[model samples]
Each structure stands twice: as structure tokens, then as C-alpha cells.
Target: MISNAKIARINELAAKAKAGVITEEEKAEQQKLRQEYLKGFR
Candidate 1:
């Protein structure tokens, strides 16, 4: 199960991306988190 903190981190990273401050690594991490979120329903 995903924790609230993990979801919050994903949102935080998205905000960083919008502000043009997200790094490539962070983008990768965001993708990873998204995949994990999707898996929860599978």
C-alpha cells in the first residue's frame, strides 16, 4: 500500500517540474511512483 507521504512527494515533484526545477532523476522517480500507483489497481 502507498503511504500518504509518498503521494505527497509525487505532488511535490510535480510542482517542482512546473516551476522548471525538477531534475532528470526526479522525473524518473515521478514515473516510478506513477507506475507503482497504477499497480495498486492491477
Candidate 2:
């Protein structure tokens, strides 16, 4: 649980995904966000 900056971006991507406007570049960034989130779980 870090800053909501990630959460904010996650929501952006979520909406973009839902609207079917997400690009491959943004998709990659979303995956990177996932990695950052899980990495802090340790």
C-alpha cells in the first residue's frame, strides 16, 4: 500500500480497458504496475 498514484493509473487503465481504447504501450505499463505492487508484498 503505497501512494494512490498507482491506484490512479490503475483506474485510468481500467477505464481505458473497459472502453476498448487501451494501447499496447499502456498495457505494458499496467503490467509493470502489477510487478511493482507485488514486489512490495515481500
Candidate 3:
């Protein structure tokens, strides 16, 4: 199962991206979290 914490982190990164200040590491993390989230869905 995907934890709430992971979801929150993903959303946080997404918001940061929208605000135009996400770092490359954060982008990488976001992609990883998204993959995890989708894997959970599957």
C-alpha cells in the first residue's frame, strides 16, 4: 500500500514544481514516488 506520507511528499514536490523551485533531486524523487504510487494502484 502507498502510505499517506509518500502521497504527501509527492504532492509537496508537485507544488514545488508548480512554484518553479523544485530541484533536480526533488524531480527524481517525485518520479520515483509516482512510480511507487502507480505500482500500488496496479
Candidate 4:
């Protein structure tokens, strides 16, 4: 179960990524957080 904080951050990063303006740094950070939360997509 992902924490609200991590979910919120994923949502935020997802929006930015959708905008095509999110930096790789942001993606990396978000991925790290998601991994930490065990929110694997595959």
C-alpha cells in the first residue's frame, strides 16, 4: 500500500511527465519513490 504522500508525488510527477516538461531527474526521483513504496507497474 502506497502512502498518500508518495501517491500524491506520483500524481504530481505524472502530470508533469504528461506535459513533456518533466526532467529525467524528476522521473528518476519519482521512480525511486514508487519503488520504495512497492508500486511496481509490471
Candidate 2: list runs displaced more than 4 Å.
none
* lDDT computed for candidate 4: 0.74
lDDT of 4 by residue, 1-42 (tens): 445676887887788786888877788887777776675543
Winner of 2 and 4 under TM-score: 2
TM-score of each: 0.63, 0.58, 0.61, 0.57
Candidate 1 deviant stretches above 4 angstroms:
1-3
lDDT of candidate 2 over 1-42, digit per residue (tens): 676777787877778786997778878888888878888954
Between candidates 1 and 2, the one scoring higher on TM-score is 1
By TM-score, the better pick of 3 and 4 is 3
Model 1 agreement with the true structure over 1-42: per-residue lDDT tens digits? 676898898788789796987778878878878987988944
lDDT score, residue 31, model 3? Answer: 85
Candidate 3 ranges with C-alpha deviation above 4 Å: 1-3
What is residue 41's positional error in candidate 1, in angstroms? 3.5
lDDT of each: 0.81, 0.79, 0.78, 0.74
Ranking by TM-score: 1, 3, 2, 4
